Amino acid sequence: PSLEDLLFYTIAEGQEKIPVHKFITALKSTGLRTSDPRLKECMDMLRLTLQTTSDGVMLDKDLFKKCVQSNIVLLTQAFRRKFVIPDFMSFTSHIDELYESAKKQSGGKVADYIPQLAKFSPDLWGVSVCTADGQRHSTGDTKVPFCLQSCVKPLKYAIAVNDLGTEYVHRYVGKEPSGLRFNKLFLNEDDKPHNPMVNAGAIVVTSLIKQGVNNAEKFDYVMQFLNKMAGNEYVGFSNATFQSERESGDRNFAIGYYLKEKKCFPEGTDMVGILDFYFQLCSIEVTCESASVMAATLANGGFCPITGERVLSPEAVRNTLSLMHSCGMYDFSGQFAFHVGLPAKSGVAGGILLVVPNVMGMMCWSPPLDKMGNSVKGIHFCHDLVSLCNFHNYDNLRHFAKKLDPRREG
Amino acid sequence: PSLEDLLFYTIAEGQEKIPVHKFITALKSTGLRTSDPRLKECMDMLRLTLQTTSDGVMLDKDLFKKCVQSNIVLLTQAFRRKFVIPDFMSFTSHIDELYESAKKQSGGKVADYIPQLAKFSPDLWGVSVCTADGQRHSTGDTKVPFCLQSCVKPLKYAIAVNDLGTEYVHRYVGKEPSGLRFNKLFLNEDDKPHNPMVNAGAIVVTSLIKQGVNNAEKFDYVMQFLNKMAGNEYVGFSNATFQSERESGDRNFAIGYYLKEKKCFPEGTDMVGILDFYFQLCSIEVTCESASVMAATLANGGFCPITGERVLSPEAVRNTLSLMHSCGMYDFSGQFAFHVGLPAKSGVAGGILLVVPNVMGMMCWSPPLDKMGNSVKGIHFCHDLVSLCNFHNYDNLRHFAKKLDPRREG
Amino acid sequence: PSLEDLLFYTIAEGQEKIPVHKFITALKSTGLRTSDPRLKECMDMLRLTLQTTSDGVMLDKDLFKKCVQSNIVLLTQAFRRKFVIPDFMSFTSHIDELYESAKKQSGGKVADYIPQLAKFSPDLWGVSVCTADGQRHSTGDTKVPFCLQSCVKPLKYAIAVNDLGTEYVHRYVGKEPSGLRFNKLFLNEDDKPHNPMVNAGAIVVTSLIKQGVNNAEKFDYVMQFLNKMAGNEYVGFSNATFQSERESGDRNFAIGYYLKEKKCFPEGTDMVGILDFYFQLCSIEVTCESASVMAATLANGGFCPITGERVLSPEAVRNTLSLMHSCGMYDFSGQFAFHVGLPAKSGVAGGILLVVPNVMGMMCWSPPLDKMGNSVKGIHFCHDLVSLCNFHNYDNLRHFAKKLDPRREG
Amino acid sequence: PSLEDLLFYTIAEGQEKIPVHKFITALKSTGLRTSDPRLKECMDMLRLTLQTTSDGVMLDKDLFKKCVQSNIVLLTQAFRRKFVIPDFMSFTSHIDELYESAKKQSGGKVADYIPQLAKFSPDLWGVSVCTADGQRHSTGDTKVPFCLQSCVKPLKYAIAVNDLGTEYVHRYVGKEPSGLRFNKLFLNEDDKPHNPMVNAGAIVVTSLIKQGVNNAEKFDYVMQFLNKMAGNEYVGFSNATFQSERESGDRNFAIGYYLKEKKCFPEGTDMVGILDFYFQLCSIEVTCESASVMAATLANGGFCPITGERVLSPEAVRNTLSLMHSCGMYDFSGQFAFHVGLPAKSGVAGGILLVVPNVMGMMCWSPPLDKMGNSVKGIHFCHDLVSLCNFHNYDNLRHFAKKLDPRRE
Numbered sequence A, B, C: 001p002s003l004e005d006l007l008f009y010t011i012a013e014g015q016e017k018i019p020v021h022k023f024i025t026a027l028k029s030t031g032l033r034t035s036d037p038r039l040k041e042c043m044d045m046l047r048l049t050l051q052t053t054s055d056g057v058m059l060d061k062d063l064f065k066k067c068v069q070s071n072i073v074l075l076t077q078a079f080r081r082k083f084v085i086p087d088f089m090s091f092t093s094h095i096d097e098l099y100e101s102a103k104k105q106s107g108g109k110v111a112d113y114i115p116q117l118a119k120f121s122p123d124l125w126g127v128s129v130c131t132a133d134g135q136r137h138s139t140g141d142t143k144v145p146f147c148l149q150s151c152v153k154p155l156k157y158a159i160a161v162n163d164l165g166t167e168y169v170h171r172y173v174g175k176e177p178s179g180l181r182f183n184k185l186f187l188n189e190d191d192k193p194h195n196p197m198v199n200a201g202a203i204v205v206t207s208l209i210k211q212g213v214n215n216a217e218k219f220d221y222v223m224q225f226l227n228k229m230a231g232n233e234y235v236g237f238s239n240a241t242f243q244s245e246r247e248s249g250d251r252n253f254a255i256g257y258y259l260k261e262k263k264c265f266p267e268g269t270d271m272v273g274i275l276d277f278y279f280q281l282c283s284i285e286v287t288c289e290s291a292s293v294m295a296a297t298l299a300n301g302g303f304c305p306i307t308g309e310r311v312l313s314p315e316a317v318r319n320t321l322s323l324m325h326s327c328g329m330y331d332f333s334g335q336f337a338f339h340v341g342l343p344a345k346s347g348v349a350g351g352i353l354l355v356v357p358n359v360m361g362m363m364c365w366s367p368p369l370d371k372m373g374n375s376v377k378g379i380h381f382c383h384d385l386v387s388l389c390n391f392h393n394y395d396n397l398r399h400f401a402k403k404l405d406p407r408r409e410g
Numbered sequence D: 001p002s003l004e005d006l007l008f009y010t011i012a013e014g015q016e017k018i019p020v021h022k023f024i025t026a027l028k029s030t031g032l033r034t035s036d037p038r039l040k041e042c043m044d045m046l047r048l049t050l051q052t053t054s055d056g057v058m059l060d061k062d063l064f065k066k067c068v069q070s071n072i073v074l075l076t077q078a079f080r081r082k083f084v085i086p087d088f089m090s091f092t093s094h095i096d097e098l099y100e101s102a103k104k105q106s107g108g109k110v111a112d113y114i115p116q117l118a119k120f121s122p123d124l125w126g127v128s129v130c131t132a133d134g135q136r137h138s139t140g141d142t143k144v145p146f147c148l149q150s151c152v153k154p155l156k157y158a159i160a161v162n163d164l165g166t167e168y169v170h171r172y173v174g175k176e177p178s179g180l181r182f183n184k185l186f187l188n189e190d191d192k193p194h195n196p197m198v199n200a201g202a203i204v205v206t207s208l209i210k211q212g213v214n215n216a217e218k219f220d221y222v223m224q225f226l227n228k229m230a231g232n233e234y235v236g237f238s239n240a241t242f243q244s245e246r247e248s249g250d251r252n253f254a255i256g257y258y259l260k261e262k263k264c265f266p267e268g269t270d271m272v273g274i275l276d277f278y279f280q281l282c283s284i285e286v287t288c289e290s291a292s293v294m295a296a297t298l299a300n301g302g303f304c305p306i307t308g309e310r311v312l313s314p315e316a317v318r319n320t321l322s323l324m325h326s327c328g329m330y331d332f333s334g335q336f337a338f339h340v341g342l343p344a345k346s347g348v349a350g351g352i353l354l355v356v357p358n359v360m361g362m363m364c365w366s367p368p369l370d371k372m373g374n375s376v377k378g379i380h381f382c383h384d385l386v387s388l389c390n391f392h393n394y395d396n397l398r399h400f401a402k403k404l405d406p407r408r409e
């Protein structure tokens, strides 16, 4: 016996050779993408042999085995229906009506704080899925770049905990939501910002990453880090949005100066420089496809699902997902933690970085904000998602009424 | 083939009959207890045949089939390692070290608010486990009764949601934590108490249960409900602490009068009576074993693990562990949700009703409280439990560092 | 060939004969109810032959032919999927999600003008469907009686036109919406009330039905008419709300006196009597199921869908849905006609008698009104219904984007 | 089996030749025209073969399948009587007497506001039909050009909603009829014009189409759009009527200035320029044949029936037909909505752009207006049309007394 031939016969279906197109649509139907980095040796040796013998698209038992030999384990799990969502193509059908039912929520106002987020169309709306096994799906404006704005706050918090540890990082920032009037206090009773998901806490966290080095290297360090979270998909930077947050952030200068007064940074901090490094991290660009892999990295204990690389410590991922649970959606956070129960994080460009732990990561994006600062279609979509599947933090995996469980068979 | 004899041959050893004592120690090894209600028919048929032959206590393939036939389904998955914790014997050993390393915490103050919760010894300490499949283990003072006090707050909330629905119940009480700033206000900004786990909201929740009938019937109904949650194990009532909580609750009279003047009850409420019903519900007695079954009912989507009866709707259990996560441990709730990540609920008698969703339910009890009102040994124990197993709400089930996962084998 | 044998084998599945329950569940799957009046000969001879041999309960070619022969035309088209909605069982599933998402609409104020509409619970909520072919479905509090109030205005208008004709009836009442400046004037520029759906016009309409006869017979005639419109389902009368609307309708007395002054009644009118008759018609009781059949008569050209009886002339049906289109939802009529595009009529009890011409009739009921006077959940439902299917008056039956069309197969 | 011969055998009538005229008159009898754009490949190859062996007008089994092969789907539905109106030739017979009894309205007065609508004869009267499947018929003066005047309001409203969407567009214009003591207020209570079908509302919608660009491009953009709506039939422009409407529209200037005062345009609007663009859009020319195809695109969910192209989004068509229902016939709208129940739009030149949804589009035209501004022969025709068939918005498709159903056999 051998898994290469075991896999060979499962696609061969009693015939003696496999057309390679029949193999890739079998592959593409599992939800994997042929561009997947863990499939690259196999696609290399398929493209080589559809050159080697350009006659017959067809593959004998060793022509198949020489091609899938080096990734065979991940193709067995794909074809033996062992991915976390086994019937991925029903799931994407469901994603599609969830996307298309959120698509007709009219309302919201595009953030017009700066000329750069007024430049985005209200009818843009994209959602991208990446599961803990690399299965992907997108619908809508998923390859359109936009800035994370404060979707970067969990990502930089995780990096800070990864290099520094929870105890150090939480000498300087709290771990609870403020209370839903204190939309306007900077510090809790211990003179620490309430948590890493508010501006005062984010600014303090930004002050802890890669100390002792200038703002050019730190930005690279976070970008090197954000690159691996996305399995090297698109992570960019829009200098346009940086310059306009550069002279329209009197609040962050207010927070920055208030924090310097009450001695909330580590010794030797250049506060004004930390604000610029902060403003830059907010102008970093992604698409929903790029970002959903970042989200799935958090869904997968800190391992990038499409590379197998250890990006974040499990301690870092854990803290980041518990604070996104409770403080991730501005004033809607408690309502969100009750009704949706998923770690999510919103940003003013229209992003919602969503994580369904142990299953998948997501990014939803539509620029029209509601009156608390959260993308309207994102909020609607994430409600309909939990109303349809047992993904809520406190749904039961055995008795879940008439919800769906994409993790299961029939 | 047939499952009854298959089970016969796995116990029989290739030998020709099974001593009845070896069947029961094999049974107890899975963590079940012979008193299990879903095992009643099978233990009935053992007591019948241990009358027939008062020596020759060994059992045929056929007579083994005679007793186990009618509970064979849950006896096989018991013996095929298909319970949520398959190696239950080691897990309780680990529970045992956790219990006995928490046992050495000197500190804490026994509640002396009343002559009845001060009359309890500081050295009592009991921990009880019930898994979603019915496996049980206890260590320490697990069978001595004590009152839930405000461990009953999630339970009566669940009942309320069960009968009325989330939308009705949350016309009258919020669903967010108040904030470690607004721990001293009675109402949120919408003139509703912040959440069902603080006295102002609990009192309001108590006013919604089974309206239109007098307080004697109401108490009976909550007691019937608490009976099903515990699989008909011990739930009692201490008239002593009822009289001493009626004699010292100017706190609740203040809250009640404020809620009654401010139009926060449903119309036709006899507020002063509701306070008595409220005081009554807090004086209800349990043991840690009884209460852990109550807890496991919540861990199990609303099905009592030792009877299989659907007690609470999944909507009620989901909401109840969602509010226990964010508002369950008084001012320690945010620190608790961060470090422990389990829905828990504390009470001044020394109780912590703990839930590991999809795994197990628990009750720890030791009357010495810390200065936030939480049992000292209870808090220490749940820190050590999550520090040892990947039970935290946002641990990953695949990559989890140096933690242990009792759900798996080798 | 034979129409009965053809049906026999289509259900028999090639097997022996048909268990009587298999035919009955097959029947209910088309959406008809065994209570259907045009099915009653077939059900008479079903229980007639289930006394024949108290156990079979299986049915030959010629005993199946024995029962269905006399309704065979209506049963084959039901079983040949030829009703206006062929796959009725998903459609009701969809109605079910529509009902359950509107059920979460918090808002509204229950009418407290009278002690009789304040007595209703804010959470009562029912929706029920009857198609032009008699297929029925219900969800929620559909069997609870409530008064039509001014849902009766289209019905009595229809009665009036049926007996007198369009030209006579519109000597006394207009046929346009007044305009959202003239929501508060009684007469249009021709000294006629603007249309039959506002109180002055309804009051005038009440003055033309069965003139020359006393008010006791007049009420009987309208009740006989409403009986036929509902296929003899529930139509009642609340003398409480009648007595309470006559003691508090100074508005209507003002209207009556003004119309009497300006000579807007037919000669020989006892105006004060017509007001009493008008108040009576507003206190007529229905349930959502009864009233939805009334609606379905209007969807069906004036033929009762569950009896085949011609109740209203097509001239009356056209005009009444033409006026319900433009003047039916008080001040919300123009906004409703735009977005919903369905003839509807709202009433203060919380009813919306809604009609999808050529498809189905409906009645939704929830007592919370919004501040234009229309049931909140009723309005939300009719928004989502049209947001989901191509039922809007000026949707296209061929190119309709991603809307659904329950009228079609695949 | 295969469709070309199934069609061949249905026309051949068991015989072995088809004269080409027998196929073509069979074709016209369905109401299609040989000029139909979705038939031109079949007609190109038809007289190609009446050139190849140009004596012998007859068609073998293989020669018929060479000619009809690329348009076969639309040729079978035509011949299997599967168009929305199957007996088109009786229906047009009915259209003929409906036209001919309306020819008998003496009355009305021709618009003489400008010398260009006074130059038209009161006895001009044309009606043209285009069904949602492209079947056509006309009677009378159907090839005579005239301007849309305010027949353009539904068309440009649709263009705006197609590009802008319902919610944006109705930030600037209401969606209700005002009420008929209020044929004279400019703005409703939210300071928006009542609806896109009155001059103040139309002027505002004209201000939302293709903002930020010059007036020549804007006009071209609307002209390209109207061209697709008519399947590239006649859409013109009367520069004469433009000069006389810019010369005599002080109320529109009155309206324009009032709307400027009350902040009713989007920021950066050159109002006086928007009026000029508005005056141009009103002087755009059509015939009743061209215009009936425009109507049928609205009858057909936004697809031009004689080209198959998607021109308007289904949302745009829906909104434009709801507002033509209720505000389309000036002060006569409510009476028209009641008795006729069809989305229609009238114009000062004498046109009525009529739509029977899911069936057909129409344009009736006779310049004599009545005292509310609607062509008398137009209004009379549309009463008798609905008086004869179950086309009213709230007729029943199953029980309709003694009316006709041209949709049925």
Ligand SMILES: O=C(Cc1cccnc1)Nc1nnc(NC2CCN(c3nnc(NC(=O)Cc4cccnc4)s3)CC2)s1
Binding pocket: C184, C185, C186, C187, C188, C189, C190, C191, D181
């Ligand atoms: O006469 C015609 C025909 C016609 C055609 C052409 C020219 N003229 C007449 N129609 C009429 N029908 N009913 C009439 N008499 C009623 C007296 C009782 N109501 C009221 N009276 N006063 C009121 N005040 C306010 O509402 C305050 C307010 C708020 C907002 C706007 N305005 C006012 S409401 C209704 C009127 S007149």
Ligand SMILES: O=C(Cc1cccnc1)Nc1nnc(NC2CCN(c3nnc(NC(=O)Cc4cccnc4)s3)CC2)s1
Binding pocket: C180, C181, D184, D185, D186, D187, D188, D189, D190, D191
């Ligand atoms: O006000 C709002 C908001 C609003 C809407 C609705 C209710 N409440 C508030 N909208 C407005 N739209 N237009 C306005 N001003 C223009 C002034 C120029 N015209 C005229 N002037 N005078 C005129 N009367 C006559 O011709 C003859 C006549 C007849 C009857 C009585 N009296 C006189 S028409 C056009 C209107 S205000």
